[PDB]
A paper describes a structure:
The circadian clock of the cyanobacterium Synechococcus elongatus can be reconstituted in vitro by three proteins, KaiA, KaiB and KaiC. Homo-hexameric KaiC displays kinase, phosphatase and ATPase activities; KaiA enhances KaiC phosphorylation and KaiB antagonizes KaiA. The crystal structure of KaiC from S. elongatus revealed a hexamer in the shape of a double doughnut with approximate dimensions 100×100 Å, whereby the N-terminal CI and C-terminal CII halves of subunits are joined by a 15-amino acid linker. Two phosphorylation sites (P-sites), T432 and S431 that are both located in the CII half were identified in KaiC.
To analyze the phosphorylation patterns of KaiC P-site mutants and to visualize potential conformational variations in the vicinity of bound ATP and residues 432 and 431 at hexamer subunit interfaces, we determined crystal structures of the S. elongatus KaiC single mutants T432A (TSa), S431A (TaT), S431D (TdT), and T426N (nST) and the double mutants T426A/T432A (aSa) and S431A/T432E (Tae). b KaiC mutations xyz or mutants KaiCxyz are sequentially shown in order of sites x = 426, y = 431, and z = 432 where the wild-type residue is in upper case and mutated residues are shown in lower case, i.e. Tsa or KaiCTSa, where the residue at position 426 is T, the residue at position 431 is S, and the residue at position 432 is mutated to A. The crystal structures of the KaiCTaT and KaiCTae mutants are noteworthy in two respects. The structures of the Tae and TaT mutants reveal that T426 residues in some of the six subunits carry a phosphate group and call into question the common assumption of just two P-sites in the core clock protein. Among the structures of the six KaiC mutant proteins reported here, those of the TaT and Tae mutants are the most intriguing because they imply that T426 can be a third phosphorylation site. The observation of a phosphate at T426 in the crystals but not under other conditions, i.e. SDS-PAGE assays using heated KaiCTae samples or mass spectrometric analyses of wt-KaiC may indicate that phosphorylation at this site is labile. However, we believe that the conditions for growing KaiC crystals promote increased phosphorylation levels relative to protein isolated from in vitro cycling reactions or incubated with ATP at elevated temperatures. The kinase activity of KaiC is enhanced under acidic conditions, resulting in transfer of ATPγS thiophosphate groups to T432, S431 or T426. Therefore, phosphorylation at T426 seen in selected subunits of the Tae and TaT mutants is most likely not a crystallographic artifact. Rather the crystal structures have preserved a third P-site in KaiCII that appears to have evaded identification by other approaches.
Residue numbers in the entry:
A (entry chain F): 14 to 519
B (entry chain A): 372 to 519
C (entry chain A): 224 to 297
D (entry chain B): 446 to 504
Write the structure that this text describes.
Amino acid sequence: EHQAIAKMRTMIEGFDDISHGGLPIGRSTLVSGTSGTGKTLFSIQFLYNGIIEFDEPGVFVTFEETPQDIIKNARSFGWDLAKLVDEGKLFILDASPDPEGQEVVGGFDLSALIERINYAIQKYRARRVSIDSVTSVFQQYDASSVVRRELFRLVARLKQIGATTVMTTERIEEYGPIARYGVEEFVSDNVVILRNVLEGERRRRTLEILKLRGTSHMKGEYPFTITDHGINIFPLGAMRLTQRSSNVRVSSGVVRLDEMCGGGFFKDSIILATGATGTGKTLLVSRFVENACANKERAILFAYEESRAQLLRNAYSWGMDFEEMERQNLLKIVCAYPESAGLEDHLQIIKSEINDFKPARIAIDSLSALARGVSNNAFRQFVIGVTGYAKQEEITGLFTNTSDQFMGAHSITDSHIAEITDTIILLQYVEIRGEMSRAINVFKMRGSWHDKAIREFMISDKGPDIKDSFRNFERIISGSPTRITVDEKSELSRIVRGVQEKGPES
Amino acid sequence: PARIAIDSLSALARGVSNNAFRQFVIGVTGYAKQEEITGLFTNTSDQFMGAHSITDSHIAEITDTIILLQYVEIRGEMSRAINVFKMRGSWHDKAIREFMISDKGPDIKDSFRNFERIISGSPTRITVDEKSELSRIVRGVQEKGPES
Amino acid sequence: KLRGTSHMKGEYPFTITDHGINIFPLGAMRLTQRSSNVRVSSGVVRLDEMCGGGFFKDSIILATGATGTGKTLL
Amino acid sequence: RGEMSRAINVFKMRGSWHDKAIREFMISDKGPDIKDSFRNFERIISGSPTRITVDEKSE
Ligand SMILES: Nc1ncnc2c1ncn2[C@@H]1O[C@H](COP(=O)(O)OP(=O)(O)OP(=O)(O)O)[C@@H](O)[C@H]1O
Ligand SMILES: Nc1ncnc2c1ncn2[C@@H]1O[C@H](COP(=O)(O)OP(=O)(O)OP(=O)(O)O)[C@@H](O)[C@H]1O
Ligand SMILES: Nc1ncnc2c1ncn2[C@@H]1O[C@H](COP(=O)(O)OP(=O)(O)OP(=O)(O)O)[C@@H](O)[C@H]1O
Ligand SMILES: [Mg+2]
Ligand SMILES: [Mg+2]
Ligand SMILES: [Mg+2]
Ligand SMILES: [Mg+2]
Ligand SMILES: [Mg+2]
Ligand SMILES: [Mg+2]
């Protein structure tokens, strides 16, 4: 690896990518952020992993939290630190103040702490260190001048010592000054900023690497989530464009359609269903999950519009028994509101559900549902998200988008995703003689030939019936077409008088 | 209640942010869907005739079935029209029916079948020789049959 | 923050009434809405015919239209 | 016909029945004088009408 600084892996989902390999050995990273941002966890996880994966003991210096609690809380993610503190793989160093204390102690004890830590490290043979909340210490009676010289001592000696330290820091505003005394930012080799931006009452946490003296790293903010497994990051930009492509084809669940698509959809591909409300996207999706089951392959449906109940109701009335799909262990419906958490979260649930079920097909009914409230950029970023996972995992995907203006919409995107999509499916209304008929259309397929016809279609208990095209109509797309006839009566089956039978006999 | 109705959620959307509104909706929608309550909602499209969208803030999505009304300017007159736009679990009529309004209520008559561009409020009457083709004078190929 | 555990993240609108603080986790509520093929009239016969028998009971029907077309009526 | 003529219409009344046609009308020193609807025109609403001049049923 071409970098000039030897880094050490945190084993934290996404960090070592963002930090181009992890924290530089022998230096110190200032991970700081507001309140409830992830700070201590990040440090805890940092020590942990170095212990559960490299057998590198580590010293943890707590300043405000109690040595008991640090163990109490760590269990939340399933970590028995007590067991590690026991096996001497993790020494916790308690420097918390006292409930019956005096007043005055943050300088010579700083000369003492260095010596203290030097003992732990020397005794436990530690290779990693985490000082949590240094801030609280100066928080006795100090200003920027005593902070730059005092930290520095620590860091520096720690560096000589040869320990790869991590320091936490608090900071009032989310975007203003990195740290409190606005000084910790320059004494450190590396600075990591955790944020919990508000915006629209929801909450988006992000992690960012302002600086790594000596190497390069991923720039700007990257969204991470805190699960029962700790921090988890999405380098939604370190997502290289190197997924596999196969001319393989699969069923849509509608046979006349498969024709319209040069012989069925492509396996490695992104399918986009767009149409005004009530046209039938939802449907095509169903017949898509269904068929993936009628072929003994797994697939998941993530509904953000209708319930797991109602999704089954309309599915049966359309034929296809979803009840069984569930039992046969072939189809799984997720179902959830977009307002039940910001994108970063959703994007993960979806991934989650794709690793615990390994589907070979996946449907997301109404991406434009998730676009509720969210700023395009944030949506477009999430769209590249899902899309990007399903593309490097041989997991055909059918996204549904509902257009905000029926009849007369000049773009089947509204959010402008029509470039991420490999193949688009188009549904829309057609006012034909006072009636609201639907018609489908295959707008684009990257590798196939597909049918250029705008065939009309009708729905029955049976499904999407693909009929013929309005050859005798101008201004189709317009919603309310114009009738111009050169024929119509032309053959096809002229012969007048008695042509039919009735129900008795034929 | 066994049924619930809110006249003009568009009456609430006054002032308030879109997001708040959209949220409010889920806020009354889901509570109705779980509580076994059949609910009907009222929305006033800001522009009469031409309306390329049926709601405003884009609520349609959190809806099972749509019943819409839209004036149709016919022969110098402002008349009504209703149409079940979409129904998720049912069949429902595709045709756009006109309707009167008197002392007994609504009488959904026929759809303007001899018209074009109805969704636009101002249609294009197009009878000019109805479906009987230019063969209304049956050519005269029918001058063989009657003799003496 | 609730060190040690999880929790719902974001703001939630609560109302201080005559029954103390009331919060509405508008996101919490799940998408597990029971359903049935049960239909119900509207008050307009023909209308029910255009729907397919009537609006289902467990449903959300939206009556949209310009001002004056008769949503109130319906 | 190249002229800016008027029109009046009771768009909606909540109790009554009110007239459904768009009646033209002119202004004189005697005040408004409502007239007859443009029965034979199209796109009245838009403002820029279009006469149908439908050739009857063409006999
Ligand atoms: N299992 C878990 N699943 C989801 N979230 C969790 C879990 N455990 C803890 N959290 C969340 O992690 C956060 C805890 O933050 P942490 O104690 O690690 O340090 P901090 O917020 O950076 O600093 P401070 O000591 O000032 O709180 C809380 O906001 C909490 O909601
Ligand atoms: N049993 C049925 N028989 C005949 N037509 C049906 C039946 N169920 C639904 N339909 C038709 O299909 C439409 C329902 O649309 P669908 O459920 O496929 O999803 P959508 O239009 O993509 O999205 P959304 O319904 O959320 O707006 C109705 O508008 C209706 O015309
Ligand atoms: N007794 C009646 N006879 C004939 N027409 C009536 C009668 N009452 C009301 N109307 C008509 O019905 C319409 C009244 O609208 P309605 O009360 O149904 O509510 P809306 O159209 O949904 O909303 P809004 O009243 O604010 O426009 C009027 O436009 C009018 O033409
Ligand atoms: Mg905090
Ligand atoms: Mg902490
Ligand atoms: Mg749907
Ligand atoms: Mg919808
Ligand atoms: Mg009104
Ligand atoms: Mg009203």
